[PDB]
């Protein structure tokens, strides 16, 4: 038993073995401000680089969201889907982890933090915890600036960690604004109500839909808008031509001040509390080692604020839950196994001698994991439970003789 | 010819007088790119929550054959993701494993039981062990996947 | 088990969507029988609420439950807005994915989005066990009346 | 449906019949065109 202590302090832990699916998703992240035009250019440049790798056969890149409620992606967010050639076509010395390394090393732009995941695994994780990456940290609180400061510090300590490849915390207020601060007194001068002025904002400047042409089963949007030259920039908006109700010819600045500002980019809420998610990408190391190393760096190099909490979520949240159920699961298995032996043989000290044969079966399993280079996971845990019942099975057929 | 105003004369002022009416793109809320050499229009098939992907993908691929005719000339549906390929690869794998273990044990329980009828007794212990299991899964509602086959 | 709630509040800033649509919604959904956790997404003109149920909850039980709580909240929302019930499926339900390409050019991006929206979507949704056929990318033809201020 | 040109192109030049190449709500036409050259 004392020899099984060497492989124990050697192996690492994961929630589950990373299952290889034919294809994988590229799900990079960036700061809140990016424009659609730029993000869509980012998408094509990123796609050409992915396609430049011999193992990938198709790259279906996506920015924004598809037309379904099952997709709430911003135009600033990219969810490109990579298909890989049959495993029979990969270069001689190749593995899935080796392909991802060439991808992560080939496909990289400034200010862009990449993330590579299996499709199915990803969709399950986001549905279960929200995080798109295996490792995730959740900064919560009621002050957006506070949680953002917190997530900012954590993000930088995270990158100091040995096994981390990238770490980016989404901002809760990195959004850019052009405020049209309508002046009631100024507008009243021209007999205009706030609603009167705003029509130029939603229609003249913005391209608000106004109606829909009917064409058989199909429908298409109709809109009203000034040519772009009039709404090019803040200064342009300050000269936005307005025909008043009394036919006075004025500019938008005559009834409003227009000021650039910063504010909420997108308001993530969990159980009615604001929250920012930090996406960490480590794939060389095992998960549990990284999370524990993050938990240290964070606790030591980041002093918490009052109403701000930090939580580790992602698969790790699942790992912890499964572990708690397993540690409670052994006694169960150990009392029942004890009773079935107790029933067949009827001898206490003897039945106790058989159930006491399983610790020797455990050590056999750990040593094999270590040699195979495997990690502890809900998979291996299961194996050890089933293995116990087989070592107790043997024990009975050795005692019966 | 949307009317905006009309004189007593009967001379109207139309929408063409104050604006140009053009066909343009709506605000894109989603962008799709294929192989880094062009923007494209795509489509995704979403499956009901507790339903069979492999089952659905078949109908989808067969409905597309019906539509190769109805589709305009030059139009090509290039598939960008197909979970059916994995299902097949995963279920062919587990099948293979089952077959291998079966034949491996038989060989073994036949080298420790020299008689063929003796080895063939422990051999008929498997194909029937399968049956009961599969008949049970059927009443249960369990489909065959790497995890249920892996069991 | 997840039930999606999508509310459109056009032109309204993120902070206003959160205050008048999302926050009211999430706080009423949190107290729905069987709700484990509830996430909210407040964008520029859009509200996404994701209601996650506890293990063993009959999926339809859940939807039917969210619907009735959606009735006793419809009023507490801005006049114009309405809380829409999302599809039966989730992101995991994305199964088959394709792109429409015309290499001759005879059909452009708008022509193909129309092909998808008004032909393909309806030829596929008839298929049993399919929750949605969603269009991704492409151009939606818009009749844009561009007014000259002068 | 067809616009006449006073100058700019030569008879015969090929041109793409699509303004459907820049997003309506907000690509800056000036710079969204720039991305197409270099």
């Amino acid at each position: 038993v004392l020899t099984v202590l060497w492989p124990l302090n050697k192996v690492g832990g994961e929630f589950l073995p990373q299952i290889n699916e034919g294809d994988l998703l590229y799900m990079p992240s960036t700061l809140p401000g990016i424009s659609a035009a730029e993000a869509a250019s980012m998408l094509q440049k990123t796609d050409k680089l992915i396609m430049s790798v011999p193992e990938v056969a198709r790259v279906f890149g996506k920015t924004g969201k598809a037309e379904t409620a099952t997709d709430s992606a911003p135009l600033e967010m990219v969810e490109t889907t990579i298909q890989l050639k049959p495993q029979e076509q990969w270069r001689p010395g190749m593995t899935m982890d080796k392909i991802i390394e060439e991808l992560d090393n080939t496909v990289r732009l400034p200010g862009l933090a990449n993330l590579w995941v299996p499709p199915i695994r990803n969709r399950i994780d986001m549905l279960s915890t929200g995080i798109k990456s295996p490792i995730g940290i959740k900064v919560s609180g009621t002050v957006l600036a506070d949680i953002d400061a917190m997530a900012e510090q954590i993000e930088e300590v995270a990158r100091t960690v040995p096994g981390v490849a990238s770490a980016l915390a989404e901002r809760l207020e990195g959004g850019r604004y052009i405020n049209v601060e309508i002046n009631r007194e100024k507008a009243a001068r021209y007999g205009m109500t706030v609603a009167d002025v705003q029509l130029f904002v939603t229609s003249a400047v913005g391209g608000a839909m106004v109606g829909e042409t009917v064409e058989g089963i199909a429908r298409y949007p109709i809109n009203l808008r000034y040519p772009q030259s009039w709404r090019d920039s803040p200064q342009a908006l300050r000269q936005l031509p307005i025909l008043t109700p009394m036919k006075q010819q004025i500019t938008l600045a005559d009834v409003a001040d227009i000021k650039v500002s910063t504010g909420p980019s997108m308001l993530k809420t969990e159980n009615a509390r604001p929250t920012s998610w930090i996406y960490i990408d480590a794939r060389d190391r095992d998960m549990v080692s990284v999370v524990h190393d993050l938990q240290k760096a964070i606790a030591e190099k980041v002093q918490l604020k009052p109403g701000t909490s930090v939580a580790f979520s992602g698969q790790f949240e699942l790992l912890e839950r499964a572990n708690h159920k397993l540690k409670l699961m052994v006694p169960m298995t150990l009392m029942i196994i004890f009773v079935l032996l107790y029933l067949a043989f009827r001898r206490v000290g003897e039945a106790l001698l058989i159930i006491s044969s399983v610790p020797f079966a455990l050590v056999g399993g750990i040593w094999l994991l270590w040699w195979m280079g495997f990690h502890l996971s809900v998979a291996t845990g299961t194996g050890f439970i089933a293995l116990a019942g087989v070592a107790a099975e043997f024990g009975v057929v050795m005692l019966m003789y | 010819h949307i009317v905006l105003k009309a004189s007593e004369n009967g001379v109207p002022v139309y929408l063409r007088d104050v604006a140009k009416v053009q066909i343009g793109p709506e605000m894109r809320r989603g962008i799709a790119e294929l192989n880094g050499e062009g923007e494209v229009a795509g489509g995704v098939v979403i499956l009901r929550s507790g339903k069979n992907a492999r089952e659905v993908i078949a109908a989808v691929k067969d409905k597309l054959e019906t539509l190769k005719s109805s589709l305009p000339e030059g139009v090509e549906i290039v598939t960008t993701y197909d979970r059916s390929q994995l299902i097949d690869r995963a279920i062919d794998n587990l099948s293979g494993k089952l077959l291998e273990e079966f034949i491996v044990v038989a060989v073994v329980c036949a080298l420790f039981l020299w008689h063929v009828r003796s080895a063939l007794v422990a051999i008929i212990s498997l194909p029937l062990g399968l049956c009961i299991a599969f008949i049970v899964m059927h009443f249960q509602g369990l489909n065959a996947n790497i995890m249920s086959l892996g069991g | 088990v997840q039930v999606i709630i999508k509310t459109s509040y056009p032109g309204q800033a993120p902070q206003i969507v959160e205050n008048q649509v999302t926050y009211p919604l999430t706080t009423t959904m949190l107290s729905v029988p069987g709700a484990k956790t509830v996430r909210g997404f407040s964008q520029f003109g859009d509200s996404y609420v994701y209601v996650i149920f506890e293990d063993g909850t009959d999926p339809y039980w859940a939807r039917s439950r969210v619907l009735e709580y959606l009735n006793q909240v419809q009023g507490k929302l801005p006049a114009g807005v309405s809380a829409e019930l999302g599809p039966d499926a989730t992101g995991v339900g994305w199964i088959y994915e394709y792109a429409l390409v015309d290499r001759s050019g005879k059909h452009d991006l708008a022509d193909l989005r129309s092909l998808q929206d008004w032909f393909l979507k309806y030829e596929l949704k008839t298929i049993p066990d399919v929750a949605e056929v969603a269009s991704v990318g492409g151009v939606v033809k818009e009749y844009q009346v561009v007014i000259d201020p002068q | 449906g067809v616009t006449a040109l006073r100058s700019g192109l030569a008879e015969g030049e090929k041109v793409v019949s699509s303004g459907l190449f820049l997003i309506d709500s907000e690509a800056n036409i000036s710079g969204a065109l720039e991305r197409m050259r270099s």
């Binding site: - | 062009g38 | 059909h107 | 030569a10 030049e13 019949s17 197409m36 270099s38």
Partner: peptide, 26 residues
């Protein structure tokens, strides 16, 4: 440290809708 280069300029090889400039009357 991949020196793998890519063409940054926009690309469209999946089909273009084209017209030719014609001389004719309005």
């Amino acid at each position: 440290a991949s020196g793998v280069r890519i063409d940054p300029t926009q690309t469209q090889n999946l089909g273009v809708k084209t017209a030719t400039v014609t001389r004719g009357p309005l």
